[PDB]
Write a protein that binds this ligand. Sequence first.
Ligand SMILES: COC[C@H]1CCCN1C(=O)c1cc(C)cc(C(=O)N[C@@H](Cc2cc(F)cc(F)c2)[C@H](O)[C@H]2C[C@@H](Oc3ccccc3)CN2)c1
Length: 390
Amino acid sequence: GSFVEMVDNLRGKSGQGYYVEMTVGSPPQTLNILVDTGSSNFAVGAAPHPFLHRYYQRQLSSTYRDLRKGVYVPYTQGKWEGELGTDLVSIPHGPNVTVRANIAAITESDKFFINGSNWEGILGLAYAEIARPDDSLEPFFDSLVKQTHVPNLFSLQLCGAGFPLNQSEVLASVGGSMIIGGIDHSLYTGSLWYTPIRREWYYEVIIVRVEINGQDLKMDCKEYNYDKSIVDSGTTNLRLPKKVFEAAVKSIKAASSTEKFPDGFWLGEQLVCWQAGTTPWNIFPVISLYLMGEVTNQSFRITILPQQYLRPVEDVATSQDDCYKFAISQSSTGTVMGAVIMEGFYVVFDRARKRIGFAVSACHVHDEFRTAAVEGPFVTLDMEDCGYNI
Ligand SMILES: COC[C@H]1CCCN1C(=O)c1cc(C)cc(C(=O)N[C@@H](Cc2cc(F)cc(F)c2)[C@H](O)[C@H]2C[C@@H](Oc3ccccc3)CN2)c1
């Protein structure tokens, strides 16, 4: 590990998001910020809200600059409205630099802030193409790279605990690492495999094959990327296009048929519980997603375990049972490789070389019999045809 200052700088969990501490303004105002590779706006609460115990106070920053323009961002789930401006921003446990970046001061919001999440803003790390109001509003990472010598790359190690974390614990626990400008070798085991960033807007990739316990889902690969597939730390679940979800659930149910679960479980709505320590991990299948490789007709695969797609939750009766919710759900906007997927790997967002790397995470949850994996190469033909075009 060559970036000790940034290792273990994240906190949080799937379900509420992973966040990093940042400062805005002069003198610096400390705020916890959700790391979101699924959007491109840097926005922070800038007015009182029931779920915030602190917020950005522009009138107290001598370096605040008003851009005199409104901004509105309606995410798939959640939305906010605010006022644009710029100010000096730093990341205490990050590169030792300070940059002037665009900041959306949130004045109104609906289902955006989460009670007890401990974060007060969001850091959209994707590209300008999807920034609101439009691509003229330079994203934070673009500003960072343009104003400093920080390499154009960042990597994320999101660490799920494998069990529920109460309010006290989640605040004291290390949730992972965001290495700005590099790759820390202590955060992963094995080799890093890279898939091309198809287009620079979201971090879009192309899935070329899907397996459930080695069994080919057998769908036209175009379906897997309809209408796109993205790597998104801002979304908890692995979300799959309607038809893929239906096929995947049917196959996962078949593989785990020795136990019957209620429909509410498969809809990702209700939890299932087992006596402490008896979760039957072995009856659930591993899921492999093959991604386009960097070499022609070559692919590699990432394999996750039920320890990744079954999200630990506290029992309603706060009993001693180990409970979980199915963290795979339906999408109408393409595949979303969310947090529960990212928790199994160290993910390298290599913007400079337009590629995303994957390696087995040093902090992924597993058992004595199976582990997550990143393997390759595999001969795969006509992978370009797996990509969707409107
Ligand atoms: C971590 O999970 C935390 C849990 C708690 C509540 C949110 N959440 C989810 O798992 C979840 C579920 C869905 C079906 C959508 C989004 C969603 O829209 N996420 C966005 C970020 C976000 C928004 C919030 F209001 C609250 C958050 F905690 C996180 C991404 O940018 C998504 C949205 C889309 O990209 C867009 C869409 C519109 C504009 C710009 C980008 C693809 N990336 C997030």
